[PDB]
Design a protein around this ligand. Structure first.
Ligand code: HEM
Ligand code: HEM
Ligand code: 3HX
Ligand code: 3HX
Ligand code: H4B
Ligand code: H4B
Ligand code: ZN
Lengths: 407, 411
């Protein structure tokens, strides 16, 4: 019932009871652990709304008050009638902040309560979505002093009137398959880069071409939009020691903004809720730049460094990996663009876990995602036991629209 | 029920059916995942069924399931059990059992080598001196002058739980750790408690930074006894860096033979409480964990200073930088001295091939992602991108309480 998690580097032991309020399943069973798998009605709705309202009023110290009972009734009535409901702005903001608070795969949750929520529920068209998204981008970028934000479009109704941002992130680079069979630009976005063209986009066919937004409002077909360049902060990548580094022709965008997730609050589903915070260095330097299936630039960098690439045991890949990541962080800091290294971010998360354990009785955390893709054990989270479980409100994965849209 | 795991780097999908044979519990529930939790006498009543499941697996493995030899064996054991409340494995069953416990060890990335395990049968051992002798032969055989050979030595199984054989050391070879009165620690901090028990038992500590600990051996539930492994039998490797001539001056060295000796081997219900085994090191075990964990030798800073790295702010990634060099040094020193070792890139690539083979020939491969992925450069190794299924199959290697916490001293 009362589970304990131990940190093997500091012997600190925390007790978790928050998991007892868990509602969704994990993918695992007592016979099998799937911890490393990437993707494990009015009658249905009211109980959800109730659970949410109870936690909402409880958080404001008005659990079971008249206001609570009242709102509970009002929502109850609304559901019975309309077969759904609308959150009060206060609930919208609380729900979003908590969905972030509950994202077990996010190492940056110590920032959870500072989220700026943009209510775009009155939106009706793709141009309207583009407008809201541009405002989000400018607000969050804040000339390099990034501020976390989320813009929430209209909730789901009949499932045939869904708003969806087709991009996986608001800002990403295009990827095109060349005759060579090789891939130019970002390989992860090869397909999307195609669906944009299958729509009319005029690809400059470059290595770092900011993709166009493909916005879907109310179910209708999506529409393309070029984000005003001055709104897309980019960072030229240079090494604080290797002048030749810049010759690599590397740069990345400063704003990470997940746009393909679904937000669940009190049973209500928000299929278009792009959100953004700021990068942890390794996301770019380790994953985007060195993944074998991404920009895969390890060899090139190792060559320039003139390292013995004959035997894996010389650890040239490891050597290069480090330099590359030193560069990413150096560049961002130099341009005064917010960014955080894995040491600092993970140190933050441990503090955050401790705060959540004392103030909330726990903190759902997914070790597989929390530990950085490089230098795992020299970061504190590696030695930290974590309990993973699903709490709502939450952020969930959802099918790429191009695999569900009825044109 | 079928289950698939996908490798997101190659899109190779695999199907697991072997998990269906999984009987033991994982620690997780439908509502919670304990995937990152370090540590999540039998009755006749429960024994024979465990015996049967095992003998069935064994006879199927040799293509004799349902034969007369199979049936007679099941009858022979059934009888022995009701007759003696236990039973003895045939040599062939023991060898098979030991190999499969390794094969089934979900946290082991070196399982591609599982079928080559050399098994030493020490079930006739009765005293600690006998244990010492067996352990010495295992170490010399396994070490093989630097060309390491995997091996396991199996002492008598548990009976009533009051006559257990145990190796109190956590590994056959490990360095002493000494807590100084000023609060600092000399040697390996991980071994401070065990070292104190050794000194108390009478060991004369040389008190250096790399003193090979003595063996503290327990036979038939008796009080443990001390023994010094012959120095000529302990292969050690001085660590130096191929480019940094000052590295050698850090005075670092490590032993070549990694030999877990505190685990419990379960086979067909029988419990082997003393079953030391060895293979060879993956570089990062020493370079990352032994040398760089904050709670171990913790040398990042000193190596950082010597390299003249900007240590003012973490974002310089000075720790990351020093880490790589230290690991380059460990691999380099071992290769130079021709002492077997494997780097994490090579070891992980091998585990992926092994894993694919296991799915195709066995229907699955239980694997613990948290442990399989190396403690450094995680995503640039293929296992990072590989989905895995973790489940417990027997035969198996299990954790057991440290003996100093359960032993009834006879004095
Ligand atoms: C302010 C700084 C923030 C930092 C440093 C941070 C860092 C991270 C990192 C490293 C990951 C894993 C990324 C990957 O490997 O692809 C992640 C995942 C995630 N974060 Fe955060 N995050 C921040 C803000 C946010 C915000 C504002 C939200 C939403 C309100 C959020 C929600 C999540 C979710 C749901 C995931 C997992 C997404 C998935 O499964 O792909 N994060 N975060
Ligand atoms: C042939 C060389 C081998 C290599 C390269 C290898 C490598 C490893 C590594 C890197 C780990 C994790 C160690 C740690 O992080 O502390 C491990 C764990 C494990 N290995 Fe292997 N291994 C090998 C041979 C063996 C042998 C011979 C056995 C048994 C017969 C075995 C049984 C296990 C077990 C049971 C674990 C888990 C230990 C625990 O949970 O504490 N390994 N191995
Ligand atoms: N810092 C953040 N990172 C999440 C988005 C970027 C990620 N590298 C892409 N990604 O999840 C790739 C798909 N597996 N979030 N945020 O600050 O809002
Ligand atoms: N290569 C092997 N490694 C396992 C034993 C060494 C480990 N670093 C010590 N250890 O797990 C200390 C406590 N967590 N095995 N083997 O070759 O048989
Ligand atoms: C197969 C495995 O689940 C997959 O590679 C995971 C591992 N850990 C991760 N951790 C983070 N933060 N992000 C990822 O994309 C992944 N990928
Ligand atoms: C808390 C966490 O589970 C623990 O530190 C684990 C993580 N992964 C590991 N992986 C290996 N190979 N060895 C370890 O000791 C650990 N420690
Ligand atoms: Zn699990």
């Amino acid at each position: 019932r009362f589970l304990k998690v131990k940190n093997w580097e500091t012997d600190v032991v925390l007790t978790d009871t928050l998991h007892l309020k868990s509602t969704l399943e994990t993918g695992c069973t007592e016979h099998i652990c799937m911890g490393s798998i990437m993707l494990p009605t009015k009658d249905q709705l009211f109980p959800l709304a109730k659970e949410f309202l109870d936690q909402y009023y409880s958080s404001i110290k008005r659990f079971g008050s008249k206001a609570h009972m009242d709102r509970l009734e009002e929502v109850n009535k609304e559901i019975e009638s309309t077969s759904t409901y609308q959150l009060k702005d206060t609930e919208l903001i609380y729900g979003a902040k908590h969905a972030w608070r509950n994202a077990s795969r996010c190492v940056g949750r110590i920032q959870w309560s500072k989220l700026q929520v943009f209510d775009a529920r009155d939106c009706t068209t793709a141009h309207g979505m583009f407008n809201y998204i541009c405002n989000h981008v400018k607000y969050a970028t804040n000339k390099g002093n990034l501020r976390s934000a989320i813009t929430i479009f209209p909730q789901r109704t009949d499932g045939k009137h869904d708003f969806r941002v087709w991009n996986s992130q608001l800002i990403r680079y295009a990827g095109y398959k060349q005759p060579d069979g090789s891939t130019l630009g970002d390989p992860a976005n090869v397909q999307f880069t195609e669906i944009c063209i299958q729509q009319g986009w005029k690809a400059p066919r470059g290595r770092f071409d900011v993709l166009p937004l493909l916005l879907q409002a109310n179910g209708n077909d999506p529409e393309l939009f070029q984000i005003p360049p001055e709104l897309v902060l980019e960072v030229p990548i240079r090494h604080p020691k290797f002048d030749w580094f810049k010759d690599l022709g590397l740069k990345w965008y400063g704003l990470p903004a997940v746009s393909n997730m679904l937000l669940e609050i009190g049973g209500l589903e928000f299929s278009a809720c792009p959100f953004s915070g700021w990068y942890m260095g390794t996301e770019i330097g380790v994953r985007d730049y060195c993944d074998n299936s991404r920009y895969n630039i390890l060899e090139e960098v190792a060559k320039k460094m003139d390292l013995d690439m004959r035997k894996t045991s010389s650890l040239w890949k490891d050597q290069a990996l480090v330099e590359i990541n030193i560069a990413v962080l150096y560049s961002f800091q130099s341009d005064k663009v917010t960014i955080v290294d894995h040491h600092s971010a993970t140190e933050s998360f441990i503090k955050h876990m401790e705060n959540e354990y004392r103030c909330r009785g726990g903190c759902p955390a997914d070790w597989v995602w929390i530990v950085p893709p490089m230098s795992g054990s020299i970061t504190p989270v590696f030695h930290q036991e974590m309990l993973n479980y699903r709490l709502t409100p939450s952020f969930e994965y959802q099918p790429d629209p191009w695999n569900t849209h009825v044109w």
